[PDB]
Design a protein around this ligand. Structure first.
Ligand SMILES: C=C(C)[C@H]1CN[C@H](C(=O)O)[C@H]1CC(=O)O
Ligand SMILES: C=C(C)[C@H]1CN[C@H](C(=O)O)[C@H]1CC(=O)O
Ligand SMILES: [Cl-]
Ligand code: NA
Ligand code: NA
Lengths: 248, 248
C-alpha cells in the first residue's frame, strides 16, 4: 500500500460524520478523497491516508532552508503521494514532482458585497481596511516575490503587520472577513466554496495569477507519470468536474 | 541547437509581415514565438524553428495506430521541442511528454449572436443548425470518446456528416460560422481571439471540458522538467499573462 499524505481542508479533505466509530481511510471524505479513490480505481494501487503531522503544506525556512509539511514528507520518502489542494509552484517543483493539475485556479480577494473596493489596487492604496493571507503559503509567497508595484505595496503592508494580518489557515482568514473589516487574499477555488455558503461575501476582482493543484510525489518517483495519465483520463471523461460539482 | 517544431495558427504563430523576405527564425512571431524566446533565455539554448511538414498537431490513425503531426516528429526524434497550441491529452501523454501547461482552456461553442441557442444540448437536440469541429483534433477526439449522452449524440451527428461539417482548420470553421447557419466547436482561447475581432460572434455556453496547452518533448527527454520549471517561473513573474495580453 502507498502512504498518502494529506491535510484537513474543506471541501478537499474532512472527517466523515457517522453515529458510529470510523477507522482507516473510511474516516475521511471530500474532493481529494474521491480523487484518490478514482486514481486507485484507474491505477490499481491500495493506500493508507495519513494526515501530515505538522499540519503544513510545504515551504522552506528563511534561515536554514529546511522544508516542512507534506513536501518534506515526500522529500524524505515518508509518503508516496501527497493529495491535497497543494499548489504547483516553482520552488516546490524544484524539490518534489507534481502531476499535471487536477484543478486550475488563482489568487483573488474574499471580501464583503456592496463596497467601493473593486480590485487589489483599491486595497493597496489604503490602510483602513486590513488585508492579508495565510502565512507561508503559495499566496503569501506570490506577494513576497512580486516586482509588480501594486503587489509589492501589498507585501510591504502585510509584512509590516505579520502578527496582525497574516493568518494560519483559510478558516481563520474567512472568520476575520466575517467579524472585522478585512479582505482576505485567498485561492479562488476556496473562495468559490465560501461564497456559495455566505451570501454576504464575494470575490473581488478577478484572478491575480494562475496556478494548478497537483498530486505530489518524491522526485524521481515512477508514480508521477502514472498519476498524470490517470488525472488526464478523469478530466476527459468529465469525472473531475462531477467531483467539483459534488463538493462545491 | 534545438530543433523546434511548430505550426501556423493565429495568434500563437504567424508569418511576420514585411516587404523584405525574411529568413530562418525571423519569419515567425506570435504568442508561442515569444514563449520560445523566453524559454530560450532562461534555459540558455539556441534553436531552429521548423513548421511541421504534414501541417498536423498529432492524432493516431484508428486503423493502424500510426501517429502524425508534431507528436510524430517528437516520437521519431526529428524535433527536440514542440511549441504550439498543442493540447495536453491522455492519448498524447502516453507517447510524448508535456510540460506543465502554459495556458488553460476548454472546448466551447462559437456562434452568431441573438439566437435562443444557449448550450451544447440546444445544438444536439436539433439538426437545422449544423455544427462541427476541426477533424482529428483534440476537440473532435473528446466527442468521439465521450459517454455523456449529449456529446455522444453530437458525435453521431458530426461523424455521419464528416464530409460536410468537419473542417481542416479553425479558420475554415470560423468562416463557416460567418457564412452559413453553423456553430463551431473550438478551443476557448481561440474563441476569445475571434470574438474580440468579430462583434457579431460570441461564445455559446461555458467550457465543455478543461485542458492545457504544454510544450511537447520526446518521452524521456531531459528538457521536460527544465521546461516545466521555466514555465512556472514565467507564470509566477507574470510574463505568461503579459504575453497573452500582447497577442490577444
Ligand atoms: C490551505 C492553504 C494553507 C494552502 C492551500 N493551497 C495553498 C498552498 O499550496 O500553499 C495554501 C493556501 C494559500 O496560500 O492561499
Ligand atoms: C488549431 C487546432 C487544429 C488544434 C489546436 N489545439 C487542438 C489540438 O491540440 O488538437 C486543435 C484544435 C481543436 O481540436 O479544436
Ligand atoms: Cl508533468
Ligand atoms: Na520536480
Ligand atoms: Na509521456
Amino acid at each position: 500500500s502507498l502512504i498518502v499524505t494529506t491535510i484537513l481542508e474543506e471541501p478537499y479533505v474532512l472527517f466523515k460524520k457517522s453515529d458510529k466509530p470510523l477507522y482507516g481511510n473510511d474516516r475521511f471524505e471530500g474532493y481529494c478523497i474521491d480523487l484518490l479513490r478514482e486514481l486507485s480505481t484507474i491505477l490499481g494501487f491500495t493506500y493508507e491516508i495519513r494526515l501530515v503531522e505538522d499540519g503544513k503544506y510545504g515551504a522552506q525556512d528563511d534561515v536554514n532552508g529546511q522544508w516542512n509539511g507534506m513536501v518534506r514528507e515526500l522529500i524524505d520518502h515518508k509518503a508516496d503521494l501527497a493529495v491535497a489542494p497543494l499548489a504547483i509552484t516553482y520552488v516546490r517543483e524544484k524539490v518534489i514532482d507534481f502531476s499535471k493539475p487536477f484543478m486550475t485556479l488563482g489568487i483573488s480577494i474574499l471580501y464583503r458585497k456592496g463596497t467601493p473596493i473593486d480590485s487589489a489596487d483599491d486595497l493597496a492604496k489604503q490602510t483602513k481596511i486590513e488585508y492579508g493571507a495565510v502565512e507561508d503559503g503559495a499566496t503569501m509567497t506570490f506577494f513576497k516575490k512580486s516586482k509588480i508595484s501594486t503587489y509589492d505595496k501589498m507585501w510591504a503592508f502585510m509584512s509590516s503587520r505579520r502578527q496582525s494580518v497574516l493568518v494560519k489557515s483559510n478558516e481563520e482568514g474567512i472568520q476575520r472577513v466575517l467579524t472585522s473589516d478585512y479582505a482576505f487574499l485567498m485561492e479562488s477555488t476556496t473562495i468559490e466554496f465560501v461564497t456559495q455558503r455566505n451570501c454576504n461575501l464575494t470575490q473581488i476582482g478577478g484572478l491575480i495569477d494562475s496556478k494548478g493543484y497537483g498530486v505530489g510525489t518524491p522526485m524521481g518517483s515512477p508514480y508521477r507519470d502514472k498519476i498524470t495519465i490517470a488525472i488526464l483520463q478523469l478530466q476527459e471523461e468529465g469525472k473531475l468536474h462531477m467531483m467539483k460539482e459534488k463538493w462545491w
